[PDB]
Design a protein around this nucleic acid. Structure first.
Lengths: 78, 208, 144, 17, 70
RNA sequence: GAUGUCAUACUUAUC
């Protein structure tokens, strides 16, 4: 309930960059970025787990108009 | 005789320093008291490995040398590179002919410039505390941000110029913060345009 | 041309395929033949510019319905239907003050766009395939 | 063709009659 | 290979009663999966927060006693 | 990762 799925991100974005971008709406407790270990590139999706479900819902509701590297990043509940 | 980790965590006042390997030692209480001390240093993580802390960075790329500013501000590195480039082009005959009658004055830069760089232009290095140990992945883990501030790389990636006017310098996600309200995870966070003055708070965020 | 042999920072050779080290040059050339090396090798714009604009005088017939605009347009002699779209008053050629309403504009290729301001928030749908029609036999455009 | 013609029309020439 | 599974401590059955009595084929793999999202989602059902005191906790009653003691 | 034969290289101002 406290985890939000962020998609539509480019492969050039980093996990400290995503943690700094997610810190503008609330402190993120954990950030998981699934990436292939054979190629060393991200899959364009990540999971941000906050400290509560209401803060995660407020972060997912305020990230509907975020643009990174020209691509719109979508936030959904997970 | 050997208790589990739950009894060692419940008996000790600091269960965060209790590990799984400390329960099968000869003194769990003494190890829990020594590991949770004030000025104690933890054990290295290479004690349970099988590579002797030197077989991990085999094929990884590494720089040859990181010269400081005081050594590079004397012109000795460029002269050494020029001497290495000139000596690599000489054959065995040019190396044998220069041993009987050498040519003096190789670089001959200065005499007091090295003393001025080592005494007047001396810069202190970036040291660390004694509690911070060293590991194999310590040289690559450099990720170890604040609410209300944005970096230059994040502003270049998101396309948001940081300026003193609060018209476009806040991100376009502030409209949702104005329509819905302040974030519940930070009640002390102040953003310009909603609960802070726009020409005064030019940092686009304040934790008060 | 072996893409696995590289030079380290200590004057040695490194095989990144098997992740092995070699001191001299004679040990790197002899490391390619073997069992472990063989196992590692086997395991691994034009339509907008050409659009003529003469801007004719359009005549719309608005009517308040209850449960709809009827735009009279001349013959275009083409298959391109006139499209309607709802936009905001924030973008304009002169940008007048106090512009905080929306405008639904219908546009065609040989004719000029006719726009009507809607002070209400939502009373209908401005979709093209939902509640619009264009009779080419009488050349009449309707939208409700 | 209708989607190509709708995405290339001028949406700034507004006229209220 | 059997050598890489015997030298690294693999192919050893370990039971984790916290995450629905799951199976783990390694001590280091279980230690890496303890500080993960699955173990955190398993521990959040009982009401225990994700901290460093419950890292080596396996049983649910021992974790509940460690949460009630603090 | 261990084992046993061979080779290369390194260190302690060793002789």
């Amino acid at each position: 309930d406290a985890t939000v799925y962020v998609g539509g991100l480019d492969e050039k974005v980093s996990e400290p960059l995503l943690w700094e971008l997610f810190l503008q709406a609330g402190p993120v407790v954990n950030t998981h970025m699934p990436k292939d270990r054979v190629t060393g590139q991200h899959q364009g999706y990540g999971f941000v787990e906050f400290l509560s479900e209401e803060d995660a819902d407020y972060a997912i509701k305020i990230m509907n108009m975020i643009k990174l590297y020209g691509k719109p990043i979508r936030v959904n509940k997970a | 005789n050997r208790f589990t980790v739950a009894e060692l965590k419940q008996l000790v006042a600091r269960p965060d320093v209790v590990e799984m390997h400390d329960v099968t030692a000869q003194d769990p209480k003494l190890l829990v008291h020594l590991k949770a001390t004030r000025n104690s240093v933890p054990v290295p993580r290479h004690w349970c490995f099988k590579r002797k802390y030197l077989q991990g960075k085999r094929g990884i790329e590494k720089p040859p040398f990181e010269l400081p500013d005081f050594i590079k501000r004397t012109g000795i590195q460029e002269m050494r590179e020029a001497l290495q480039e000139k000596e690599e082009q000489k054959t065995m005959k040019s190396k044998m002919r220069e041993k009987v009658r050498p040519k003096m004055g190789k670089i001959d830069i200065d005499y007091q410039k090295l003393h001025d760089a080592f005494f007047k232009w001396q810069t202190k290095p970036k040291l660390t505390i004694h509690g911070d140990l060293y590991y194999e992945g310590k040289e690559f883990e450099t990720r170890l941000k604040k609410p209300g501030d944005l970096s230059d790389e994040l502003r270049i990636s998101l396309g948001m110029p940081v300026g003193p006017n609060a018209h476009k310098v806040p991100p376009p996600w502030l409209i949702a913060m104005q329509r819905y309200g302040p974030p519940p995870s930070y009640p002390n966070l102040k953003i310009p345009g909603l609960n802070s003055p726009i020409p005064e708070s030019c940092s686009f965020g304040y934790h008060a | 041309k072996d893409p696995y042999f590289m030079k380290n920072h200590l004057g040695s050779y490194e095989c990144k395929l098997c992740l092995t080290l070699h001191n001299n040059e004679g040990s790197y050339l002899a490391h390619t033949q073997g069992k472990k090396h063989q196992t590692n090798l086997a395991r691994r714009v034009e339509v907008k510019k050409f659009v003529k604009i003469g801007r004719p005088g359009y005549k719309v017939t608005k009517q308040r319905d209850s449960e709809l605009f009827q735009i009279d347009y001349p013959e275009i002699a083409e298959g391109i239907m006139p499209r309607h779209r709802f936009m905001s008053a924030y973008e304009q050629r002169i940008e007048p003050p106090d512009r905080r309403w929306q405008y639904l504009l219908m546009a065609a290729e040989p004719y000029e766009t006719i726009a009507f301001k809607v002070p209400s928030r939502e009373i209908d749908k401005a979709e093209g395939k939902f509640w619009t029609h264009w009779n080419r036999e009488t050349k009449q455009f309707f939208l409700q | 063709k209708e989607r190509v013609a709708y995405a290339q029309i001028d949406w700034h020439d507004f006229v209220v009659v | 290979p059997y050598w890489l599974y015997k030298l690294h401590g693999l192919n050893i059955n370990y039971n984790c009663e916290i995450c629905g009595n799951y199976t783990y084929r390694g001590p280091k793999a279980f230690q890496r999966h303890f500080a993960e999202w699955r173990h955190a989602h398993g521990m959040r059902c009982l009401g225990i927060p994700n901290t460093a005191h419950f890292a080596n906790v396996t049983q649910i009653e021992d974790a509940v006693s460690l949460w009630a003691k603090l």
